Design a protein around this ligand. Structure first.
Ligand code: HEM
Ligand code: HEM
Ligand code: HEM
Ligand code: HEM
Lengths: 146, 141, 141, 146
């Protein structure tokens, strides 16, 4: 995390406009669709057989909202991501057994989702700040792996 | 491999890019320079300033190559041979950088084609850029 | 693309492995688990302790498949069809991990085949594991 | 690092047995051979047309010794690779234009050369400690890129 004050304001400004419920479902759905191998963690979610089956799955939507919820909180502690995400890092490792590479894929998908949503407002420099943020979060989420 | 579906998806989305390909190519480069500064090591000879004519010029070139790969979606290895040779033998760009540009290309399209940038299209476009990348890196060793 | 020299190099090196391939398979896993602990996420049901029979048995399995790949160096895609299936549709290991196992395998060979682990042989084995990796992840999407 | 005292002695003790001269020339040569694209920075070294020509090239051999030299000295500041490699980080960026990914390739080549050399002695646990160092060094060298 090397975020300039002006980078931090930019992240925060945009995030103000996001509908976490909605973005959460879109980001998670898209992950499962672009990188189908990631579906390995959700066999209890039911039908993920087609893009529509994934995107509209009430379980994917609810999970996505949960994930982005935790993420939004991360955005208020940009100062202490490791601390913020420590119990979650442990859970993902020890209980869920989620390969941390999954956290980077989602970060990239999220960036595409924000671009999709904000159009021209998601400028080159706004993207650069968000790139730093998703990487910091992925790193914080992987810090407790062992 | 690219399925019939993927091919349709790609031709369709690229179809919409049309005459903007050049500008979108340039924008993808700028996004890449800003988000992944290590990619700049390959353009020490470029003016990487905002609105650089060099970047503009280079964006067009990249866009033309992509447009050429869409036009020859069934014979990419041959349609891109020349470019594959250049990259392998002269430019010698480390393979990891391809994934970085691909990513910034996806961001650019997303930002410009909201109606077409569906999950299905997104997936197809990602698989496409991965294929282009694989071709360009095929003769590295 | 493996050159004829590569195929030779590979067949030679693997030839020396012989009856120890299982042991080397097991050693490479052990090195992977320790060096890249994130790889353990795919084996929650295993006892990853040093000298576990699960690790040993699995080491054998992997070595055997490598053997079979060397043997069908010319027809990998076909020799490993089942395994590409298994990995793409069941296991679903993230592609990044293949590079980690490949590296641990080189390290293992280096450590055990000093005379045979020449620079040119090293180059070939790397390309070979890369090719095996490509095959194993080709039906992912 | 995030090197355990035990993992530190493991690193420290193998190294003391290392002939930097030979190991540096071999690590660099292997790099130019395994990953041919890295030759882009050494055009002026001469004939790198074959493994034999690379391995025999004295310019290559002498550069390898210089590189491992610097690496060697960094092993003395395992608690501040960042400050130890700051100037070298700037140089590589600003003057040499070397993609930091190269630092990673070398690191891995280095590990293969050590295994090659020490056989038995280069155990899984010792490899694990070295993997941490090579990564740490790559990170430090890449730190000042902008
Ligand atoms: C920004 C990154 C992420 C954050 C902040 C996050 C957050 C969360 C939270 C808050 C929970 C619920 C915890 C609980 O059940 O006590 C959870 C569960 C879970 N997460 Fe993550 N997550 C992230 C990324 C991912 C990714 C990328 C995957 C897989 C590709 C994943 C897989 C899971 C699974 C499988 C569960 C359990 C779901 C269930 O109840 O069956 N997570 N995550
Ligand atoms: C799919 C992705 C890519 C495509 C389609 C592409 C295509 C091209 C094309 C068409 C050219 C111009 C060659 C000529 O003069 O005719 C070029 C040159 C070049 N490319 Fe690639 N390229 C790709 C990826 C990359 C990446 C990822 C990098 C580095 C980050 C890179 C670095 C360069 C450089 C340095 C040049 C030479 C520019 C100059 O000196 O004018 N390329 N590329
Ligand atoms: C060099 C490339 C690889 C080869 C040749 C290979 C080969 C194999 C083979 C032969 C099997 C057993 C099939 C059977 O049970 O009939 C297997 C299973 C498995 N592989 Fe792959 N593998 C490779 C890479 C990986 C990597 C990198 C990972 C994860 C980091 C992995 C994870 C697994 C897992 C989790 C299993 C199932 C283990 C069990 O439940 O017994 N594989 N692989
Ligand atoms: C362990 C990582 C590395 C270390 C500690 C390191 C260190 C050094 C040192 C100490 C110099 C001396 C130059 C001076 O002080 O003016 C140097 C130069 C140089 N290094 Fe690095 N280096 C590393 C990796 C690499 C890699 C992987 C490459 C490219 C594949 C590279 C390319 C160069 C080049 C091209 C020069 C200039 C030599 C000349 O002027 O002929 N370095 N490096």
């Amino acid at each position: 995390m090397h975020l300039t004050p002006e980078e931090k304001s930019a992240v925060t400004a945009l995030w103000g406009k996001v509908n976490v419920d909605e973005v959460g479902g879109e980001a998670l759905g898209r992950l499962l669709v672009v990188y189908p191998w990631t579906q390995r963690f959700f066999e209890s979610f039911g039908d993920l057989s087609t893009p529509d089956a994934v995107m509209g799955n009430p379980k994917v939507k609810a999970h996505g909202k949960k994930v982005l919820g935790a993420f939004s909180d991360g955005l208020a502690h940009l100062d202490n991501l490791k601390g913020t995400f420590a119990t979650l890092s442990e859970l993902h490792c020890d209980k869920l057994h989620v390969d941390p590479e999954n956290f980077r894929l989602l970060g990239n998908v999220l960036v595409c989702v924000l671009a999709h949503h904000f159009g021209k407002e998601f400028t080159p420099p706004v993207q650069a700040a968000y790139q730093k943020v998703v990487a910091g979060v992925a790193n914080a989420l992987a810090h407790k792996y062992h | 491999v690219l399925s019939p579906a993927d091919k349709t998806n790609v031709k369709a989305a690229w179809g919409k890019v049309g005459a903007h390909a050049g500008e979108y190519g340039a924008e993808a480069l700028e996004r890449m320079f800003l988000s992944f500064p290590t990619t700049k090591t390959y353009f020490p000879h470029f003016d990487l300033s905002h609105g650089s004519a060099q970047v503009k010029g280079h964006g067009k070139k990249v866009a033309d190559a992509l447009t050429n790969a869409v036009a020859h979606v069934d014979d990419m290895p041959n349609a891109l041979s020349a470019l594959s040779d250049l990259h392998a033998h002269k430019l010698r760009v480390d393979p990891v950088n391809f994934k970085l540009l691909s990513h910034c290309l996806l961001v650019t399209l997303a930002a410009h084609l909201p109606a077409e940038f569906t999950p299905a299209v997104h997936a197809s476009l990602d698989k496409f850029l991965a294929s282009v990348s694989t071709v360009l890196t095929s003769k590295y060793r």
